[PDB]
Structure 1
């Protein structure tokens, strides 16, 4: 049918007019197919013959699908699409299974010949003009135009969507306690009614839809659980990921590892513990797709650990609006975090992992906070509420960090859970100068042209040292200088630098870095017992800084 729904007024972009793309001359066979296909469509009101007036045209083509000798009509709307107004956006997200509420009875109903059952604005149909050419550019071809939403036109997905929303509204009002999910041409229905009433409510729905030009499958034609939906396997009381097969292979290509990471990231939605970090590392630099990449010892271990996890089929449970959501997080390793969300201890609605920030100098407290943030956002999206957190960090550790850090931070309601490895700060800078501790005045310089540099210090105990560095930057020398002072100092040290840069990094109590150097410094800071770090402006009559600036600057402009 063709829905009796009011049409959506459509228009072309401001300073633009309809398409006028000439018809390619087509084969005798292809022309025959188009004629019959179009005759059928015309008989169903999907299209209509037009006069010679209409100056618009869009190319038409015909292709036959294999294992069958049945032709299909392809319209190239690339041009009309560039000229068609922008629309809304169908949806901002796809439902996640974990967010599906528990309902005793669920039915899937798909809207049949979807796009073709919806009318197109009459004032816009003129722009959908296409031409079946005559055997060898004889005379005018048979010219048609759409009356319904054309397959492959820009506004079809959105217009269909709206039409369905308008159609479902009255039924929604009269049945507030029934859930309907709109997805493309599909329609999922859930209720907490015992079959009997439910099949009745379904039937009533279909009748409401049919009364509006939309065909659906009848009972015996409806799909039955499991439902293979967008990568998922849906059962009435549990869900999981579509069967994942990890290819047993000798020699892996970039393409193979890429697909592997894909499946793994995908499986991470319900299978806890999946680690992908070591595989991603192999994908660095890549330069090719067919090039084989030898697996590191670490990747082989990671892959093996993943297989173990995937050997045992895991399932997710559905959402109960009456119960609280609980999210638990654990540290898997270097910048690796996993989490799980449940309502009833250990009956997971969903799983996930976190591994951001490319080592821009961070610590476990910052990372944990980031993971909490990410989980909080998805919870709001999926369930409309934030979960209660279970974190492997002491309230004391948390308060100490937050109160003293420069950035505002805030975790929703959480509870400590003794699940090692626990999160902690590995070292802490002193708040005031250490009495009876050697004072190192450090500094570093680097020539912009030659990239050559010097790093060193001078103490109050009269010590001195200056190292030469090659292929360096000002930043690197400043960090080198601090590293030097930490190496030659021992348990208690006062260090005075002129680098806001280094002060900034160290003050944030990092425990991980992409910089081999910063790691040296961290490793060294952990060994100390007491460390005080101060800053002074450079190029000033400031005793100490004024002097290291000499030996470090000499020979390096």
Structure 2
């Protein structure tokens, strides 16, 4: 026998009560045949009228195609059934598998029907078979085993399988057993004779618990078509990916591209993803963009070359190497031997504006690090296109705590660098610009300008600008009209922040103009002063622009 998991319904809910819909008498007889057979094997049992609960029963009428099946909708029973410990959504990644001498797949047949259901819960699974004539009362059964649509069957099957496997795993620890839904993947490094011996021991051990294994026909074909992958005994890859597209045709294309990026390096989806903005109607078409169409042409070229990944060797280091490909886009490879990759991937910028290539690189290292721990259980060593001097300068002066594991520079351009550095101290003999901006919230127009120690002044009128755009534009004017060495004084806490963060690029066009002016300057010092305190030229520029 197999121990039952005590199951309960939600606190304020009761067993389902749904009347079965009328069904064609051809199907009804087929349902009678299936349920009488299941009654024979102990899986279901006929219920008396004392049971009030009912759940809808459907069917597919028997045919040569796999249309001879009993279906039951437990959606209302599922809504009334307790929550369980969710079976893991993460799927084992092939690049984390360790090559074994042999590896057999054993799928369990009638897996849910081999595990008993809690007797106290059985009543709620009650189903009534339809009556051929409306005058006939229907015949009713309830499940004694785990129903195929029920909310609890996957998790109760998994836990039952774990308990059955525990002694055999203890008895034979050299053998590695992986569990996936209804399947057991068993690998070992024993000699081929002993490996097929222990499989039969395992195959026989599950039968004593009522679990049937594909002993005669093991699907032993070393290339396994599993969850979109090809698992060869020497390697793994992705299953072949098929290369005018409507909006939904784009989405499935991007999905197939991302799925390809596990092992095919240099797959790009950024242009298509920008196309898939809003436009929630799948029927509506997307306009073809030459740059996006180019993105597909490059991907088709990559997909032409067959790529394979290697399995994992616990005795060697994991290396992760990152390339900045394009703006905001990053690509990385993970390998142990110099040209054989374990797998591949990409990383793209976060949604926020005003980012730095160094910030993005550090985040990408962060992403890869978590991925490695999930797949392999350790962190990799890194190869990064950033000088140690660039990183050390960045970390020492960066307001946040940052870290990267051990890493070695790799002289592969594009190299990650800091496009400019602000001066810590004021510059002697450099003109001092006191800037300010202001704007009307009711009328989107505004003004911006500066006043300097040498008596220079400027005001420019602005349209459709917020107060923050003006404060940022006022700094822009001062950079444009300044020499190579300039001191700028602003009261804008907002503008100080954007520039202090030393962003490499931005979404806002004004900030990009500021960065490009900063790159052209030899020395820039930015200083902050409290607004409205009668300080310096801050009060003078305040009147010059808000008047």
TM-score per shorter chain, which class?
A: over 0.9
CA shift at 1:380, angstroms? 0.2
Residue 106 of structure 2: which of 109, 114, 133 is its match? 109
Deviation of 1:359 (Å):
5.0
Deviation string 1:354-379 (CA, Å, 9 cap, x unpaired) is: 11213511111111101000000000
Deviation at 1:274, TM superposition (A): 1.2
| Cα offset, 1:92, TM superposition | 4.7
From 334, 338, 347, the counterpart of 2:331: 338
Distance in 2 between residues matched to 1:519 and 1:416, nearest whole Å: 29
| Aligned counterparts of 2:525 and 2:120: Cα–Cα separation in 1 | 76
Alignment partners' CA distance in 1, 2:338 and 2:66: 57
The RMSD of aligned alpha carbons is 1.5
**8 Å CA contact retained: 1:442, 1:496:** yes
Aligned partner of 1:137 among 122, 129, 134: 134
Supply the distance in 1 between the matched residues of 2:281 and 2:439 (Cα, whole angstroms). Answer: 37
Larger displacement relative to structure 2 (128-137 or 405-414): 128-137
> Gaps (5+ residues) in structure 1?
none
Q: Which string of whole-angstrom CA distances, capped at 9 and with x for unpartnered residues, describes residues 411-436 of structure 1?
A: 01111111111110010000001111
Tell me how many residue pairs correspond in the alignment: 547
The structural deviation recorded for 1:133 is: 2.7
Contact 2:26 2:61 in 1 (8 A): no
Q: Secondary structure of the equivalent of 2:27?
A: helix
Which whole-Å CA distance do the structure 2 matches of 1:66 and 1:553 have between them?
83
Structure 1 304/115 Cα, relative in aligned 2: closer, same or farther at 3 Å? same
Could you say if the C-alpha distance between residues 149 and 291 of structure 1 is closer, same or farther in structure 2, counting changes exceeding 3 Å?
same
TM-aligned CA distance change 1:524 to 1:50, over 3 Å: same
Note the alpha carbon deviations across 1:16-45, whole angstroms, 9 max, x for none. Answer: 211112222333223222211111111111
Q: For the Cα contact (< 8 Å) 2:30–2:62, is it kept in 1?
A: no
Alignment deviations for residues 224-258 of structure 1 (CA, whole Å, 9 cap, x no partner):
12111111111011001110121xxxx33111221
With over 3 angstroms needed to count, the CA separation of the structure-2 counterparts of 1:380 and 1:69, relative to structure 1, is closer
Moved more, 24-33 or 440-449: 24-33
CA distance in 2, matches of 1:226, 1:178: 20
Decide which moves more: 227-236 or 251-260.
251-260
Q: Secondary structure at the match of 1:343?
A: strand
SS of the residue corresponding to residue 287 of structure 1 reads coil
Tell me how far 1:388 sits from its aligned partner.
Answer: 0.5
SS at match of 1:252: coil
CA distance in 1: counterparts of 2:63 and 2:356, whole angstroms: 58
2:530 is aligned with 1:537: yes
Cα distance in structure 2, aligned partners of 1:352 and 1:38: 50
Distance 1:287 1:170, change over 3 A: closer
* CA distance in 1: counterparts of 2:89 and 2:69, whole angstroms: 32
Offset of residue 219 of structure 1: 4.1
The 8 Å contact of residues 443 and 455 in structure 1, kept in 2 or not, is answered as yes
Cα distance change of structure 1 residues 65 and 329 upon mapping to structure 2, 3 Å threshold? farther
Kindly indicate whether the alpha-carbon contact (under 8 Å) linking 2:32 and 2:129 is maintained by their aligned counterparts in 1. Answer: yes
Deviations 1:484-538 (A, max 9, x none): 1111112111111111111111111111111111111111110101000111111
Question: How far, CA to CA, are the matches of 2:280 and 2:76 in structure 1?
Answer: 35
Structure-1 separation of matches of 2:346 and 2:65? 46
State yes or no: 1:390 paired with 2:383.
yes
Q: After superposition, give the CA deviation of every residue in 1:388-415 in whole Å (9 maximum; x if it has no partner).
A: 1111111111000000000100001111
The answer on whether the counterparts of 2:104 and 2:218 sit within 8 Å (CA) in structure 1 is: no
* More displaced stretch, 32-41 vs 116-125: 32-41
Choose 195-204 or 274-283, whichever is displaced more: 274-283
Q: Distance in 2 between matches of 1:257 and 1:50?
A: 52
- Report the Cα offset of residue 470 of structure 1: 1.9
Match for residue 44 of structure 2 among 37, 43, 47? 47
Which has the larger displacement, 212-221 or 324-333?
212-221
Corresponding residue number in structure 2 for 1:79: 76
Q: Deviations over 1:155-208 (max 9, x none)?
A: 011000101111111111111221111000011011111211100011111111
- Relative to structure 1, the CA distance from residue 9 to residue 69 in structure 2 (aligned partners, 3 Å threshold; closer, same or farther) is closer
Structure 2 residue 273 is matched with structure 1 residue 280: yes
Moved more, 44-53 or 350-359: 350-359
**C-alpha displacement at 1:451, in angstroms?**
2.2
Q: Deviations over 1:263-287 (max 9, x none)?
A: 1111000011111112212222334
1:66 Cα deviation after fit: 7.3
Separation in 1, partners of 2:223, 2:30: 39
> What aligned pairs does 1:516-527 form with structure 2 within 5 A after superposition?
516-527=509-520
Q: Could you list the structure 1 runs, at least 4 aligned residues long, displaced by more than 3 angstroms after superposition.
A: 64-71
User: Which whole-Å CA distance do the structure 2 matches of 1:70 and 1:158 have between them?
Assistant: 27
Q: Offset of 1:108 from its aligned partner?
A: 0.6
- Distance of 2:65 and 2:136 partners within structure 1: 32
Tell me, yes or no, if the aligned pair for 1:130 and 1:145 is still in contact at 8 Å.
yes
- The 8 Å contact of residues 482 and 495 in structure 1, kept in 2 or not, is answered as yes
After TM superposition, give the deviation of residue 69 of structure 1 in Å: 8.5
Map of 2:168 onto structure 1? 171
Partners of 2:280 and 2:437 in 1: how far apart?
A: 37
Cα separation, 2, equivalents of 1:298 and 1:359? 24
Give the Å deviation of 1:65.
7.4
Secondary structure (helix, strand or coil) at the match of 1:161 reads helix
Secondary structure, counterpart of 1:162 in structure 2? helix
Bigger mean CA deviation after superposition, 470-479 or 429-438: 470-479
How far apart are 1:64 and its partner, in Å? 3.4
1:358 and 1:514 in contact (8 A); partners too: no
Match of 2:208 among 207, 211, 235: 211
SS of the residue 2:325 aligns to: strand
Deviation at 1:478, TM superposition (A): 1.2
Deviations 1:282-338 (A, max 9, x none): 222334323333332222222222112111100000001111101111110101111
Question: Any conservation in 2 of the 1:25–1:136 contact (CA below 8 Å)?
Answer: no
Q: Which moves more between the two structures, 361-370 or 302-311?
A: 302-311
